């Protein structure tokens, strides 16, 4: 799609010049996008997962895997092996198709949107942004949603540093806070 073509033709040659790499193989790319929904109210409500899956299914376009509890935790009333979340890993076209829709369409629909933060890099050039409403995604219908619930969206990149990752994401339409 347009963003993959934009990456190869425009962004990657620019980053080569920008950072003055020896090889084109050094140019940072987006590896994968992991979308996570933590669903701790699955402890209480059994159908919370079934719903949360269905939302994430349409948003991403792949069937999510249902994550389970690594430990029992008393504070949360969590037992080991309980379904308490759902992730989906996006690579290739399904990744760029998603990331295009995120930037082009969904992040505009965020209520009172004033850019995504410049702080939210991990220190090694991976970006994570927290969505609050699943209503922003155009596949999600307003009427069908009952329980409102957000998600984490990890953008993993081959950038070693934040400034290299920042550049790549800025070169994509991603609206960083001015």
């Amino acid at each position: 799609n347009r963003l993959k073509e934009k990456y190869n033709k425009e962004i990657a040659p620019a980053l080569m010049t920008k950072f003055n790499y020896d090889s084109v193989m050094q140019v940072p790319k987006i590896e994968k996008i992991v979308i996570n929904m933590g669903v701790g109210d699955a402890v209480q409500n059994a159908k919370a997962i079934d719903s949360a899956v269905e939302e994430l299914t349409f948003i991403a376009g792949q069937k999510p895997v249902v994550t389970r509890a690594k430990k029992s935790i008393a504070g949360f009333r969590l037992r080991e092996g309980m379904p308490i979340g759902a992730k989906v890993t996006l690579r290739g076209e399904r990744m760029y198709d998603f990331l295009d829709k995120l930037i082009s369409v969904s992040l505009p629909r965020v209520r009172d949107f004033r850019g995504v933060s410049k702080k939210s890099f991990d220190g090694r050039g991976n970006y994570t942004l927290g969505i609050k409403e699943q209503l922003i995604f155009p596949e999600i219908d307003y009427d069908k949603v009952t329980k409102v619930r957000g998600m984490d969206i990890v953008i993993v990149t081959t950038a070693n540093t934040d400034e290299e990752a920042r550049e790549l994401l800025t070169q994509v339409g991603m609206p960083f806070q001015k």
Binding site: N1, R2, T57, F58, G61, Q62, K63, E93, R94, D97, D100, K101, I103, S104, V105, L107, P108, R109, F113, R114, G115, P138, E139, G173, P175, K178
Partner: protein, 46 residues
């Protein structure tokens, strides 16, 4: 992509009422948005 388990995913075409047009991949056949990157003010600048 192991067959059966996933939803149907195909050409889409998103359309800003504001005028912008482009074709992503999605579940819906005709996506119609009332806002996008080119219309929204953070992106444009006001």
């Amino acid at each position: 992509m192991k067959a059966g388990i996933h939803p149907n995913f195909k050409k889409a075409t998103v359309k800003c009422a504001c005028g912008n047009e482009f074709e992503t991949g999605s579940v819906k056949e005709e996506v119609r948005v009332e806002i996008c990157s080119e219309c929204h003010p953070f992106y444009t600048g006001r």
